[PDB]
Design an enzyme around this catalytic site. Structure first.
Site, PDB file in Angstrom:
ATOM      1  N   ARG A   1      44.347 -59.632 -57.696  1.00  8.78           N
ATOM      2  CA  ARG A   1      44.587 -60.923 -57.076  1.00  8.78           C
ATOM      3  C   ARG A   1      45.947 -61.480 -57.489  1.00  8.78           C
ATOM      4  NH1 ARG A   1      39.527 -63.426 -54.780  1.00  8.78           N
ATOM      5  NH2 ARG A   1      37.789 -62.192 -55.612  1.00  8.78           N
TER       6      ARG A   1
ATOM      7  N   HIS B   1      35.224 -62.871 -47.789  1.00  8.13           N
ATOM      8  CA  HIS B   1      35.211 -64.135 -47.064  1.00  8.13           C
ATOM      9  C   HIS B   1      35.566 -63.939 -45.595  1.00  8.13           C
ATOM     10  CE1 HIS B   1      34.574 -66.477 -50.680  1.00  8.13           C
ATOM     11  NE2 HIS B   1      34.690 -67.601 -49.997  1.00  8.13           N
TER      12      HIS B   1
ATOM     13  N   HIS C   1      44.344 -63.844 -52.692  1.00  6.96           N
ATOM     14  CA  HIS C   1      44.293 -62.576 -51.976  1.00  6.96           C
ATOM     15  C   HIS C   1      45.690 -62.236 -51.479  1.00  6.96           C
ATOM     16  CE1 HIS C   1      40.126 -61.201 -51.804  1.00  6.96           C
ATOM     17  NE2 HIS C   1      39.751 -62.462 -51.700  1.00  6.96           N
TER      18      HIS C   1
ATOM     19  N   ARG D   1      42.886 -68.221 -47.477  1.00  2.00           N
ATOM     20  CA  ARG D   1      42.739 -67.328 -48.623  1.00  2.00           C
ATOM     21  C   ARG D   1      44.090 -66.972 -49.233  1.00  2.00           C
ATOM     22  NH1 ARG D   1      39.105 -68.655 -51.022  1.00  2.00           N
ATOM     23  NH2 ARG D   1      39.061 -66.680 -52.177  1.00  2.00           N
TER      24      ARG D   1
END
Length: 345
Positions: A83, A119, A170, A164
């Protein structure tokens, strides 16, 4: 092949920096998009509405969501994704050049790997199923109806991707792959017609096979020495405030929820309280369906506020399974039966 990974990570960092600098007054919208995109909403709102509207879109929606969760959880252990919030401070790419500035929000710091992007995958699959089912109806100004629905679907997907990316959680390729995987899963389940008229035996066997495969795969990976909690050490020193990191002591929290939802749907469909209210009943008219929808939504929203204790792993697992299985039962068999009896006078 480290050069390609470094290039992709640098592009992700540049995109995050650009979004965080040029769009300062969009924090609230992105936080709202990121919190609405949870799959709890899919299992608590979108399913009761569709099941009482078509009786078949809800089943496909639930199956797609559960299988997407299973695939995401399985691939999370082996894809080994990173990440952006800890990569920027723990790399060597910016050793002779200025390090780009990244800002972390209370939603940024996360503990799990971020390769499958669970997600965008679920949202993509669920909304693709809903749009395809909606366009299946009203088939017989249809060209004007197609483009608006597809533009709305892609606008939702782009908003989720940007939300995101903005929160530095991400990289663009991870979210794009998640969207494509969700679309592929939904399209694959579009071609299966044996998931409607299935007895309890099939549901039980499928749930048992999924649980056994997940547990066996986890144990096999742990035995060989493959590291599985490699991210807990990174989301402990690169988080600006220690209060933002919530350690997880229940690695199997969501698999049991998905299995509970599947088994609850299986139990509810094959019951006497179902084929006496929702099927083969004289008093079946649209106000009855609307009343059932409203009652189910309100009671599910009220019921969601029960949090099982996390002190004991076995008790927590059993209570999570039961609470996830309760929703399909209440939404399919219990509530419509009560409304049929009360309103049938």
């Amino acid at each position: 092949m480290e050069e390609g990974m470094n290039v992709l990570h640098d592009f992700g960092i540049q995109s995050t920096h650009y979004l965080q600098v040029n769009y300062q007054d969009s924090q609230d919208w992105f936080i709202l998009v990121s919190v609405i995109a949870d799959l709890r909403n899919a299992f608590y709102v979108l399913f009761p509405i569709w099941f009482h509207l078509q009786e078949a879109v809800g089943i496909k929606l639930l199956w797609v969501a559960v299988i997407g969760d299973w695939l995401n959880l399985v691939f999370k252990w082996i894809l080994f994704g990173q990440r952006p919030y800890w990569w920027v401070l723990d790399t060597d790419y910016y050793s002779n050049t200025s390090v780009p500035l990244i800002k972390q929000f209370p939603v940024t710091c996360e503990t799990g790997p971020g390769s499958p992007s669970g997600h965008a995958m679920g949202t993509a699959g669920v909304y693709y199923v809903m749009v395809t089912s909606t366009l299946s109806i009203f088939q017989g100004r249809f060209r004007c109806l197609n483009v608006i629905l597809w533009l709305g679907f892609w606008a939702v997907q782009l908003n989720v991707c940007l939300s995101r990316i903005y929160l530095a959680a991400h990289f663009p390729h991870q979210v794009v792959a998640g969207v494509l995987s969700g679309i592929a899963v939904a399209e694959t389940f579009s071609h299966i017609h044996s998931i409607y008229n299935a007895s309890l035996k099939k549901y039980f066997l499928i749930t048992f096979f999924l649980f056994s495969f997940a547990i066996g795969f986890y144990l096999l990976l742990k035995g060989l020495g493959v590291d599985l909690l490699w991210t807990l050490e990174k989301a402990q020193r690169w988080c600006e405030q220690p209060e933002w990191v919530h350690i997880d002591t229940t690695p199997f929290a969501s698999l049991l929820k998905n299995l509970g939802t599947l088994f609850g749907l299986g139990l509810a469909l094959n019951s006497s309280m179902y084929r006496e209210s929702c099927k083969g009943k004289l008093s079946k008219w649209l106000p009855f369906r609307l009343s059932s929808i409203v009652a189910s939504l309100v009671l599910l929203h009220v019921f969601d506020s029960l949090k099982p204790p996390s002190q004991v792993e076995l008790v927590f697992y059993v209570l999570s399974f039961c609470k996830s299985a309760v929703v399909p039962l209440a939404s399919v068999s219990v509530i419509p039966y009560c409304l049929a009896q009360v309103l049938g006078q």
